[PDB]
Ligand binder design. Structure first.
Ligand SMILES: [Ca+2]
Ligand SMILES: [Ca+2]
Ligand SMILES: [Ca+2]
Ligand SMILES: [Ca+2]
Ligand SMILES: [Cl-]
Ligand SMILES: [K+]
Ligand SMILES: [K+]
Ligand SMILES: [K+]
Ligand SMILES: [K+]
Length: 208
């Protein structure tokens, strides 16, 4: 006698992974489930799991997988999602790794503010006095930060890659007792670069 033949998935992505860009708009098709049933039985498709079912939805008859909630690679960069296909006699399931693709959607962040440092007026030229860091969680160029002063300073320099602030001209407590500088931290995305400003207070102390 014949036993029912269960359906099986035919998507090539099950053996590797699915890529979905984090800026994919809700409602978008992210893929279409494909399956075969050698009895030519009508098939129904789904997704299961609390988390998977929250972010993704499946058209039961077409197997089109939709995006149901916005993604954010910086919050969750991948999913293991279980999809199902059924001929109404049995349910077959397979898991797929879904990678969330990066876009540059974060500006750098400065931590441990406010930034202030006290130095003596005889601190010599070339003396490193402060190290700035801004974090950027994006990937590649979009996560690589460069530093500068805006506007520039004739008394202080900041190393662009390293954020090391140095004295570049002799100081003088009587001429200037304090400097308020502005640090620009910008990522290096080619098309959409993002940047952030932080205040740096430099206080000059008197020897006498
Ligand atoms: Ca069947
Ligand atoms: Ca994001
Ligand atoms: Ca990102
Ligand atoms: Ca960035
Ligand atoms: Cl299968
Ligand atoms: K479901
Ligand atoms: K750094
Ligand atoms: K980074
Ligand atoms: K003095």
């Amino acid at each position: 006698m014949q036993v029912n033949r269960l359906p099986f998935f035919t998507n090539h992505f099950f053996d590797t992974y699915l890529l979905i860009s984090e800026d994919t708009p809700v409602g978008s098709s992210v893929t279409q489930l494909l399956a075969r049933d050698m009895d030519n039985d009508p098939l129904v498709f789904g997704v299961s799991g609390e988390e998977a079912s929250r972010f993704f939805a499946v058209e039961p008859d077409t197997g089109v997988v939709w995006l149901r909630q916005p993604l954010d690679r910086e919050t969750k960069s991948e999913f293991t999602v279980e999809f199902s296909v059924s001929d109404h006699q049995g349910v077959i399931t397979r898991k797929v790794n879904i990678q969330v693709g990066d876009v540059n959607d974060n500006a750098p962040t400065f931590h441990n503010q406010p930034y202030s440092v006290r130095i003596p007026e005889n601190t010599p030229v070339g003396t490193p006095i402060f190290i700035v860091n801004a974090t950027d969680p994006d990937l590649g160029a979009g996560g690589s930060v460069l530093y500068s002063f805006q506007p520039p300073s004739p008394f202080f320099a900041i190393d662009s890659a390293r954020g090391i602030v140095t004295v570049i001209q002799e100081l003088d407590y009587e001429v200037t007792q304090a400097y308020q500088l502005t640090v620009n931290a910008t990522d290096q995305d080619k098309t959409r670069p993002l940047s952030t400003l932080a205040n740096l207070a430099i206080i000059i102390t008197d020897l006498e």
